[PDB]
């Protein structure tokens, strides 16, 4: 249909760009306070506090600068697979298999964290949650449906439908007017937070998509699937751009994150370590390892000061 717009490949345009090079990134500090496997992790807007969810029933907020635990929210359900951190920093979200997006208020009397609101209405297991703002939150569930939520009422403000498979992850654009989600049918949908429509459909993968992240300008995004390929898509041309595939790697991708500049791409693989990709050259520029188990989380701060990776070995590391 839109193959007429495919005039040239980005690699041919980016062939003249100087490569990033084999950058070496080391672990400045390791966060080892959890007990069970880590499945969720989010970065704060202040680039100071990060929250991680483990299977022990504990929601721990970590102080990245001082390596300390600011909070430890006792989860009602020990099974959690997603978490979020509010842009204001007052609330923290957590999902799981209980179909409940528990939100806790950090700013309370005597420093006692309490459940701000109980969210229900998803028949499938929750897979991803993202805070649009202090008043709204987008949640991805295993019932092939994602919906927008309101805090003080808890009702279904806007429900996004059109996914054939269950959604695994989603990310929010910097302007927060649009967001995309990746399901298990090797497809990605663009949803408007105000209208809840399906402007265009992104696809091209050969397996289930498990990672979603926008480009820092908001005009593009990348997907991470289990077909051992990372695919970057743009909201304007709506095509496949610069697939990140290597013959050495055959394992899937579980987390994809973008640096603040967007020049290099962070991709989390289940081969017991994480990988760093060049977002314009599709070259494996720098490889970081050290996780005892497979990595499950990957996020970059707003200012790009540091990047954190969450693995199943109950260890959190910060890379610079």
């Amino acid at each position: 249909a839109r193959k007429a717009c495919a005039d040239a490949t980005l690699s041919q345009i980016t062939n003249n760009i100087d490569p990033v090079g084999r950058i070496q990134m080391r672990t400045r500090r390791t966060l080892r306070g959890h007990l069970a496997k880590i499945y969720a992790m989010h970065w704060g807007t202040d680039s100071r506090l990060l929250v991680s969810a483990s299977q022990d029933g504990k929601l721990i907020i970590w102080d990245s600068y001082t390596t300390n635990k600011v909070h430890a929210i006792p989860l009602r359900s020990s099974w959690v697979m997603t978490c979020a951190y509010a842009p204001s920093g007052n609330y923290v979200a957590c999902g799981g298999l209980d179909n409940i997006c528990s939100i806790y208020n950090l700013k309370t009397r005597e420093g006692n964290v309490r459940v701000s609101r109980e969210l229900a209405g998803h028949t499938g297991y929750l897979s991803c949650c993202r805070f649009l703002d202090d008043n709204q939150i987008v949640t991805s569930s295993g019932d092939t449906t994602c919906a927008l939520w309101d805090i003080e009422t808890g009702q279904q403000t806007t429900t996004f439908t059109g996914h054939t498979g269950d959604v695994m992850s989603l990310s929010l654009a910097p302007d927060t007017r649009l967001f995309v989600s990746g399901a298990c049918d090797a497809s990605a949908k663009l949803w408007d937070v105000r209208e809840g429509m399906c402007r265009q459909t992104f696809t091209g993968h050969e397996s289930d998509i498990n990672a979603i992240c926008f480009f820092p300008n908001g005009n593009a995004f990348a997907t991470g699937s289990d077909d051992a390929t990372c695919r970057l898509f743009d909201l304007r041309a709506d095509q496949e751009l610069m697939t990140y595939s290597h013959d050495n790697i055959i394992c899937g991708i579980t987390s994809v994150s973008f640096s603040k500049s967007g020049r290099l791409l962070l991709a989390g693989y289940d081969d017991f370590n994480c990988n760093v990709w060049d977002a314009l050259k599709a070259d494996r520029a720098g490889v970081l390892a050290g996780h005892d188990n497979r990595v499950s989380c990957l996020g970059v701060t707003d200012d790009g000061m540091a990047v954190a990776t969450g693995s199943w070995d109950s260890f959190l590391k910060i890379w610079n």
Binding site: L35, Q55, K69, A72, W79, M81, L97, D98, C184
Partner: protein
């Protein structure tokens, strides 16, 4: 250094109470319930003792038990079965009467073979329960078992028909030396069914401790 000392001090309190908070998980036994249809999580939960997943807490012989039922989860199991990796044991509930209805027993092993040979369930044993035994005899007297499997269970006698089905569930795994499979015929008594669970999990605790004790 007043502000930084208080942050570390309150973080030390966070690390202190998680030492026993996570220790209670070690004492507690995590049990996972599987089932082809509505037959899962109906037998043991019927005992009178104490949204997506319903968990039952009950202490037997001074041992805490936590049973997790995933019947309400209608999503693809390949996305969330790895979340349950590391449980103490897996409890499988299948109705012996579910062979003359549309074929359900063929789907039961299809669910059973996926969970038993799963890559994340290598060290976790499975305690399968052959339910509906009270009316299984009447059902096989009404209609032969040959309609389910072309290889008949002997000569259509209850003594060997139930013994044939249990073996057909215990030979699907190739990892027989890696983990053991416990089979029990549920009866019309809550104290008899929970007793087998306690003994089966006890053996799992014995097996699991041996790797830490170095015997294995």
């Amino acid at each position: 250094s007043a502000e930084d000392k208080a942050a570390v001090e309150r973080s030390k309190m966070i690390d202190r109470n998680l030492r026993e908070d996570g220790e209670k998980a070690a004492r507690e036994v995590k049990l996972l319930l599987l089932g082809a249809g509505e037959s899962g999580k109906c037998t043991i939960v019927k005992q009178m003792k104490i949204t997506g997943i319903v968990e039952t807490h009950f202490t037997f012989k001074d041992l805490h038990f936590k049973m997790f039922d995933v019947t309400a989860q209608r999503s693809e199991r390949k996305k969330w079965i790895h979340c349950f990796e590391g449980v103490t044991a897996i409890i499988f509930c299948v109705a012996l009467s579910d062979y003359d209805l549309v074929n359900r027993m063929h789907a039961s092993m299809k669910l059973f073979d996926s969970i038993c040979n799963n890559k994340w369930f290598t060290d976790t044993s499975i305690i399968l329960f052959l339910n509906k035994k009270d009316l299984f005899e009447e059902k096989i007297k009404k209609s032969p078992l040959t309609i389910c499997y072309p290889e008949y269970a002997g000569s259509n006698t209850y003594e060997e028909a139930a013994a044939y089905i249990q073996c057909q569930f215990e030979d699907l795994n190739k990892r027989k030396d890696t983990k053991e499979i416990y089979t029990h015929f549920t009866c019309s008594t809550d104290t008899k069914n929970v007793q087998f669970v306690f003994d089966a999990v006890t053996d799992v605790i014995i097996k699991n401790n041996l790797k830490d004790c170095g015997l294995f």
